[PDB]
Amino acid sequence: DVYAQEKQDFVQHFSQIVRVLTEDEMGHPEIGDAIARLKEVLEYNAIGGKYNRGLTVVVAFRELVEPRKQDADSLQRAWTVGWCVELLQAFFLVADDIMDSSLTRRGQICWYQKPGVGLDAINDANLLEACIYRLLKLYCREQPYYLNLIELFLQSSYQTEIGQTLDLLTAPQGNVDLVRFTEKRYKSIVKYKTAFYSFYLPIAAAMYMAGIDGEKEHANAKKILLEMGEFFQIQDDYLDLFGDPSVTGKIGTDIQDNKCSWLVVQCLQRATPEQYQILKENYGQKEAEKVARVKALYEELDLPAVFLQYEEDSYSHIMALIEQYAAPLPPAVFLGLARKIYK
């Protein structure tokens, strides 16, 4: 795929990002110790993932911009804006792992769990966020899209933070309540906390870099991308349990962690008073036996079949969304992304 083609150049560019960001202690030797800590924070948190969100900027750039205008400088800017997306995610992950007491992230121990780090990781998360705007100034200050990119990264941080607030209010640690776990609530959490920054932001960033700044074009691209975001998170909640972890790189911690998953939401909708009481008793419990009972209840309520009928309607619908709203953008912009998610 077009993602694997662009990966190597993109991952190689991280060294440049780190160099340019650590080139602040040249004239200001006084902050050197802080800059060394910033480097360590970048290396641990911005590296070790799939880089899919960041690569989406680069892939979309290649497809939106005329090959003739894709010079050395424009590509460097595309790889930087791609890394800004990856930094925005690192900032979210570092902080979210603190708030939900996570132990591991991308196979390794969470940054905040590292000895000597702890709650200092809050400042580290803030620094990761600050790096975006430093990189945008260093690389894009002179571009006609500079302001659009700044506003886009700010609006996406804001939407994600609203999504995170909504998530925290729905699943309060200690105040365990399944009444709050509605489809309307789930869809809003997914839209604000995940779909905007993961799907709309990288394509939207690529669009502005190509000079596509029209509100209607951005509204059209957003209608497609937000639906792709809903599907992705719904599919990810299934794979957390009903998915053979050979393919993935994570296992079912959602039942024991008391998460507002798409599974628990459908389970509640299709529940009899007795079925609900079983879920009420077993969901969110650290006990192995209790986790095993929820899985059995999900299987009983046709949830692997419910997810298949959802996939079916979703495959056709995203194709309808691309058919109707991709123009004037090349449909391959959305299709290349949908292939990675839907297959």
Sequence ranges of the binding site for isopentenyl diphosphate: 50, 53, 89, 106
d(CA 236, CA 146) in angstroms, rounded, equals 34
Q: Are 233 and 190 in contact (CB under 8 A)?
A: yes
The number of residues in the chain equals 343
308: Cβ contacts below 8 Å, ≥ 6 apart: none
Query: Which one of ligand 5BJ, its own copies, none interacts with residue 50, CB within 5 to 8 A by kind?
Result: ligand 5BJ
Angle between helices 14-21 and 2-12 in degrees, nearest 10: 30
Longest alpha-carbon distance in the chain: 69
d(CA 271, CA 214) in angstroms, rounded, equals 46
Instruction: Quote the least distance from Cβ 4 to its own copies, whole Å.
Output: 34
Instruction: Quote the least distance from Cβ 256 to ligand 5BJ, whole Å.
Output: 21
Give the tokens for residue 334. 């959305």
d(CA 53, CA 197) in angstroms, rounded, equals 8
Residue from 198, 220, 258, 314 touching ligand 5BJ (CB under 6 A): that is 198
Q: Which residues are annotated as a binding site?
A: 50, 53, 89, 96, 100, 105-106, 193-194, 233, 250, 259
Say whether 236 is catalytic: yes
Helices (H), the chain: 2-12, 14-21, 32-45, 52-64, 72-99, 121-140, 146-170, 183-190, 201-209, 215-241, 262-269, 273-282, 288-300, 303-325, 332-342
Query: Which one of ligand 5BJ, its own copies, none interacts with residue 172, CB within 5 to 8 A by kind?
Result: its own copies
Say whether 193 is catalytic: yes
d(CA 255, CA 40) in angstroms, rounded, equals 33
- Does the footprint of its own copies cover residue 147 (CB under 8 A)? yes
Instruction: Quote the least distance from Cβ 240 to ligand 5BJ, whole Å.
Output: 12
- Does the footprint of its own copies cover residue 40 (CB under 8 A)? no
- Does the footprint of its own copies cover residue 158 (CB under 8 A)? yes
Say whether 100 is catalytic: yes
Distances from the Cα of 46 to the Cα of 103, 124, 278, angstroms: 18, 12, 41
Please give the single-letter amino acid code of residue 324.
Q
Say whether 50 is catalytic: yes
- Does the footprint of ligand 5BJ cover residue 340 (CB under 6 A)? yes
Residue closer to its own copies, measured from CB, 161 or 217: 161
Say whether 73 is catalytic: no
Compose the 47-66 pattern: x for residues touching ligand 5BJ by CB under 6 A, - for all others: --xx-xx--x----------
Say whether 181 is catalytic: no
Residue from 55, 127, 207, 241 touching its own copies (CB under 8 A): that is 127
Using CB under 8 A, list all residues that contact its own copies: 30-31, 33-35, 37-38, 95, 98-99, 116, 118-120, 122-127, 130, 133-134, 137, 146-147, 150-151, 154, 157-158, 161-166, 168-169, 172-173, 175, 184, 188, 191-192
Using CB under 6 A, list all residues that contact ligand 5BJ: 49-50, 52-53, 56, 198-199, 232, 337, 340-341
Instruction: Report, as residue numbers or ranges, the catalytic residues.
Output: 50, 91, 96, 100, 105, 167, 193, 232, 236-237
